[PDB]
């Protein structure tokens, strides 16, 4: 690995500089190098890893959607034949996106998840695993699609089981996991009623626990609750 010669602390430092410069590909490469040092990640380091890859894959997903829409219009009746270029370029972007997802999943499997014993780290990584299988599922069209969807579901479900046992209903990791699992149900699993039920239950249980929080924790939790509310407004 090209980061093998750089100190762990220097990789972390540079990941933070890359974030400030909005150089998210660099950020992700620095954080991959830090993970590959083999030590567990702190809370702040886990969130650097997540931010970096979320931004990289977010740009790829947005580009893939643009190209997929153009390709679908090319296959309408009355559309002029333009050759293989749209499909080829959509496939190029798709393959890169799949490569980034495989990279993240590989870091989680070797060996972030197996070393994560505290609920806050284990739930975080299992949520990531569900997310990156979900991004694979967004572009999947073949004979492994059902298994990719089930891999996302299984990771989210394990994270949910731990989070419900070990975290309060207002914990931001628990809330963000429930938010993303509800999106999985709505957008991937063709289960809009499950998505709505999960979002509503998550919101209501967090509401009832806000009274226990400091002002700063209240701000953290209500920000994610608003995303659940935004989705419920979209979906109902």
């Amino acid at each position: 690995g090209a980061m093998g010669s750089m100190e762990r602390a220097s990789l972390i430092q540079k990941a933070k500089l890359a974030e400030q410069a909005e150089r998210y590909e660099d950020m992700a490469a620095f954080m991959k190098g830090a993970v590959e040092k083999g030590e567990e990640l702190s809370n702040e380091e886990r969130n650097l890893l997540s931010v970096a890859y979320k931004n990289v894959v977010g740009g790829q997903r947005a580009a893939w959607r643009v190209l997929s829409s153009i390709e679908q219009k090319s296959n309408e009746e009355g559309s002029e034949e333009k050759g293989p270029e749209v499909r080829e370029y959509r496939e190029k972007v798709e393959t890169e996106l799949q490569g980034v997802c495989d990279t993240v999943l590989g870091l989680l499997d070797s060996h972030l998840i197996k070393e994560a014993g505290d609920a806050e780290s284990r739930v975080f990584y299992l949520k990531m695993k569900g997310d990156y299988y979900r991004y694979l599922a967004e572009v999947a069209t073949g004979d492994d699609k059902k298994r990719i969807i089930d891999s996302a579901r299984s990771a989210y479900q394990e994270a949910m089981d731990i989070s419900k046992k070990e975290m309060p209903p207002t914990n931001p990791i628990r809330l963000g996991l429930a938010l993303n699992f509800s999106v999985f149900h709505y957008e991937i699993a063709n289960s809009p009623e499950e998505a709505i039920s999960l979002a509503k239950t998550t919101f209501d249980e967090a509401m009832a626990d806000l009274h226990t929080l400091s002002e700063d924790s209240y701000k953290d939790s209500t920000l994610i609750m608003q995303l659940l509310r935004d989705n419920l407004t979209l979906w109902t």
Binding site: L179, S182, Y186, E187, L227, D230, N231, W235
Partner: peptide, 6 residues
């Protein structure tokens, strides 16, 4: 697109 965690 529904909002996922930011």
């Amino acid at each position: 697109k529904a909002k996922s965690c930011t």
